[PDB]
Amino acid sequence: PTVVGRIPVLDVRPVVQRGRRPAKAVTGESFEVSATVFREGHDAVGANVVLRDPRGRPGPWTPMRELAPGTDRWGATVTAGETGTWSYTVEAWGDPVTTWRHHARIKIPAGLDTDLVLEEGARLYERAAADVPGREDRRELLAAVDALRDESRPAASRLAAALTPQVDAVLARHPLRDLVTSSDPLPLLVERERALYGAWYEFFPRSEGTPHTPHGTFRTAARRLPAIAAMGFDVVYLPPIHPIGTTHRKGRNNTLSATGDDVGSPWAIGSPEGGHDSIHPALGTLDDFDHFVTEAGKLGLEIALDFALQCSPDHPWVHKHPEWFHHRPDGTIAHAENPPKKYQDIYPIAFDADPDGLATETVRILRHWMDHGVRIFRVDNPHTKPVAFWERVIADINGTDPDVIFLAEAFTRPAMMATLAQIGFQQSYTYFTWRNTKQELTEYLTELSGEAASYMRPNFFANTPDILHAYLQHGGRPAFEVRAVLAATLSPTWGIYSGYELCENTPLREGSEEYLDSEKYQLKPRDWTRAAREGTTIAPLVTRLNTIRRENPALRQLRDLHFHPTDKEEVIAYSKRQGSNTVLVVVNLDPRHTQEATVSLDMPQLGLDWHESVPVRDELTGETYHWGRANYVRLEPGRTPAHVCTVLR
């Protein structure tokens, strides 16, 4: 047996780890399948993609085209349907009709043995006719055959009968394929919509309390949910909801020693009151949690729980499972670190003494929360636990519950970030917060929307409790408006951490990305009613952005994204498209000065001719413009951070 087939079909993409892991999509998402296809000699080839669903059923006829002249790289767009494990192959073939037509169009006017050429054509169309299932399509081809063979008619007339639109239409649907050769199947994992698309909001239930009871409960925190839903969010991410250790508990502002009624960090999980399968006693009971989840569901909100595989020194595991920790020669366990960050309040887990025990307990814990309606987990620092551990855990959970979504909170080097996505994480945190200039944004999004989209789905949090970027610190409210527009329109999944909409931007100290008086170490009551009344919140802009996203399919996908040139460094422009929906975004990255610029649209990339002028509506204002190949914009901080335009129909 040979490695190459009769008609070479090579290097089918997308491909992940040479086929050992699946490429990814979600229901309704389109993407390109491509291959290198050519044959020996000089005759034409054709190619098509065969996408098979989880029951092996092939999709519609999906012909490919050569993507660029002389490259022999062919491609076609496919669209994923129901969730599950699909497969795709590329079929390559000789295209004898295209070949014959090319020669015949030349030879017949030249008078070069025309009877012979026309008979060859007749014999080809006879072959084409035999395969065609449709009775009417068959009679149409056979009529062309008889016209080709009518020696009483002019050569040019015999040939023309073989080239009619009626005949073209038949062959376009049912081409004559020679020597059909197939690639080996590649796997496609199709997952639910929310894996790619959704708006996330992070908040601490304990901060949403009452005058008489400052520490929030699930019942008081449930009253915060309506405002979150009203802002258009789909997912609420909660920090760990478990009992918190007392040994080495951190104080306010990340001080080493807690005093008085300091509440400590939620990530310091575990006490004699319970571990990762238990609820902080001040938050209430599992029944109260069920109420919170029910209320969330009523509002169209899904819960994402933080899963942080680490222990306070008071966690029951410490003495129940000593081999789940690395001990020094004096028996002590070194506290966790993420250099230069130190986490004196927790121990990290060790995995090589009892990997089966840890995996078994991990999926038991996850299934407990799954049984109470949690179908999304935000996984804390997965890159400090073994990659194969997550591959195993995610495979186990999704094996029974393929709807569960895992988000990788891995801010680390690119190889690890990519690998975590490839081995199963549905979503990844990204470098978004550290990409703020036009060049940074353009280069990074070109990366994420390109080949990486075959295995990684970005979740653009504009802030987190650990990341208050200098851009926001220096820029104030207009900078918050800018990053919200960017996050919401560049990724189909974005998020903010509570307080973002209040433009909280006071750092721990100059040069830090930590918040002053961080919510991680103290209750952080916020007077939401007062903020709304006084208009000191960008909640309405957030709400508008999520509405625009919900109304425009272009913003609910990742892979179609194009950057358009402008003549100002501070002004970025880009378009996204999905079917007939086109969104055009122009953002002023300068939060302190008005910028005016000319935006020169790459019109063919919009499916428009260079001279055309198209009506657009700025969905942030309702204003309508007519935009073409060159457009004046004037963007004023605090007033017009950006244009978010839809192309009108």
Ligand X SMILES: O=P(O)(O)C[C@H]1O[C@H](CO)[C@@H](O[C@H]2O[C@H](CO)[C@@H](O)[C@H](O)[C@H]2O)[C@H](O)[C@H]1O
Binding site for ligand X (CB under 6 A): 250, 254, 265, 267-268, 308, 338, 341, 343, 345-346, 380-381, 409, 411, 465-466, 520
**How many Cβ atoms are within 10 Å of 176's Cβ, its own excluded?**
23
Cβ within 8 Å of residue 639, ≥6 positions away: none
- Specify the residue, 263 or 614, whose C-beta has the smaller distance to ligand X: 263
Among 328, 509, 611, 649, which residue interacts with its own copies (rule: CB under 8 A)? 328
Among 53, 72, 396, 514, which residue interacts with its own copies (rule: CB under 8 A)? 72
Q: Of the listed 95, 295, 314, 409, which one is catalytic?
A: 409
Q: Which stretch binds its own copies (CB under 8 A): 67-75, 221-229, 271-279, 498-506?
A: 67-75
DSSP 297-326: HHTT-EEEEEE--EE-TTSTHHHH-GGGSP
Whether 427 has a binding-site annotation, put simply, is no
Helix (H) or strand (E) holding 63: none
Residues 79-96, buried b or exposed e (16+ Cβ, 10 A)? Answer: ebbebeebbbbbbbbbbb
- Specify the residue, 417 or 647, whose C-beta has the smaller distance to ligand X: 417
Whether 43 has a binding-site annotation, put simply, is no
Smallest distance from the beta carbon of 68 to its own copies, in angstroms? Answer: 12
Residue 70 interacts with its own copies (CB under 8 A): yes or no: yes
- Specify the residue, 197 or 324, whose C-beta has the smaller distance to its own copies: 324
Pick from 554, 574, 582: which is nearest to 647 by CA?
A: 582
- Specify the residue, 351 or 625, whose C-beta has the smaller distance to ligand X: 351
- Specify the residue, 378 or 643, whose C-beta has the smaller distance to ligand X: 378
Residues 177-210, buried b or exposed e (16+ Cβ, 10 A)? Answer: bbeebebeebbbbbbbebbbbbbbbbbbbbbbbe
Beta-bridge mates of residue 92: 47, 181
Residue 251 interacts with its own copies (CB under 8 A): yes or no: no
Residue 149 per-residue DSSP state = T
Smallest distance from the beta carbon of 187 to its own copies, in angstroms? Answer: 12
Smallest distance from the beta carbon of 401 to its own copies, in angstroms? Answer: 19
Whether 521 has a binding-site annotation, put simply, is yes
Q: Is 356 a catalytic residue?
A: no
Which option in ligand X, its own copies, none does residue 383 bind, with CB closer than 5 to 8 A by kind? its own copies
Instruction: Report helix, strand or coil for 596.
Output: strand
Smallest distance from the beta carbon of 150 to ligand X, in angstroms? Answer: 37
Q: Which stretch binds its own copies (CB under 8 A): 139-147, 187-195, 416-424, 606-614?
A: 416-424
Smallest distance from the beta carbon of 393 to its own copies, in angstroms? Answer: 10
Q: Which stretch binds its own copies (CB under 8 A): 64-72, 84-92, 595-603, 630-638?
A: 64-72
Which option in its own copies, ligand X, none does residue 36 bind, with CB closer than 5 to 8 A by kind? its own copies
Beta-bridge mates of residue 167: none
- Specify the residue, 343 or 500, whose C-beta has the smaller distance to ligand X: 343
Q: Cβ distance 491 to 605 under 8 Å?
A: no
Which option in ligand X, its own copies, none does residue 54 bind, with CB closer than 5 to 8 A by kind? none
Which option in its own copies, ligand X, none does residue 169 bind, with CB closer than 5 to 8 A by kind? none
Which option in ligand X, its own copies, none does residue 415 bind, with CB closer than 5 to 8 A by kind? its own copies
Rounded CA-CA distance 361/376 in Å is 18
Among 5, 28, 54, 63, which residue interacts with its own copies (rule: CB under 8 A)? 5
Interaction with its own copies in 337-356: which residues (CB under 8 A)? 337-339, 348, 352
Which option in its own copies, ligand X, none does residue 267 bind, with CB closer than 5 to 8 A by kind? ligand X
Residues 307-336, buried b or exposed e (16+ Cβ, 10 A)? Answer: bbbbbbbbbbbbeebeebbeeeeeeebeeb
- Specify the residue, 95 or 409, whose C-beta has the smaller distance to ligand X: 409
Rounded CA-CA distance 627/649 in Å is 14
Beta-bridge mates of residue 200: 235, 495
Among 419, 428, 552, 640, which residue interacts with its own copies (rule: CB under 8 A)? 419
- Taking each helix axis from N to C end, the angle separating 438-449 and 470-490, rounded to the nearest 10 degrees, works out to 40
**Pairing mode of beta strands 493-497, 198-202:** parallel
Which option in ligand X, its own copies, none does residue 70 bind, with CB closer than 5 to 8 A by kind? its own copies
Whether 520 has a binding-site annotation, put simply, is yes
Smallest distance from the beta carbon of 315 to its own copies, in angstroms? Answer: 20
Which option in ligand X, its own copies, none does residue 350 bind, with CB closer than 5 to 8 A by kind? none
Residue indicated by tokens 């999704």:
398
Which option in its own copies, ligand X, none does residue 67 bind, with CB closer than 5 to 8 A by kind? none
**Pairing mode of beta strands 73-79, 65-66:** antiparallel
Q: Is 636 a catalytic residue?
A: no
- Specify the residue, 187 or 322, whose C-beta has the smaller distance to its own copies: 187
Residue 432 per-residue DSSP state = G
Q: What residue ranges in 59-154 does DSSP mark as E strands?
A: 65-66, 73-79, 84-94
Instruction: Examine residue 465 and say whether the peptide bond preceding it is cis (omega within 30 degrees of 0).
Output: no
Rounded CA-CA distance 466/278 in Å is 25
Among 132, 167, 235, 423, which residue interacts with its own copies (rule: CB under 8 A)? 423
**How many Cβ atoms are within 10 Å of 341's Cβ, its own excluded?**
10
- Specify the residue, 67 or 169, whose C-beta has the smaller distance to its own copies: 67
Instruction: Report helix, strand or coil for 153.
Output: coil
Cβ within 8 Å of residue 84, ≥6 positions away: 53, 54, 190, 402
Cβ within 8 Å of residue 160, ≥6 positions away: none
Q: Cβ distance 550 to 234 under 8 Å?
A: no
Q: Of the listed 380, 481, 570, 590, which one is catalytic?
A: 380
Residue ranges for the known binding site are 250, 310, 345, 381, 520-521
What residues line the site for its own copies (CB under 8 A)?
2-6, 8, 10-11, 15, 17-21, 36, 38, 40-42, 70-72, 116, 119-120, 123, 179, 328-330, 337-339, 348, 352, 383-388, 391-392, 395, 413-416, 419, 423
Active site residues: 380, 409
Residue ranges for the known binding site for alpha-maltose 1-phosphate are 250, 310, 345, 381, 520-521
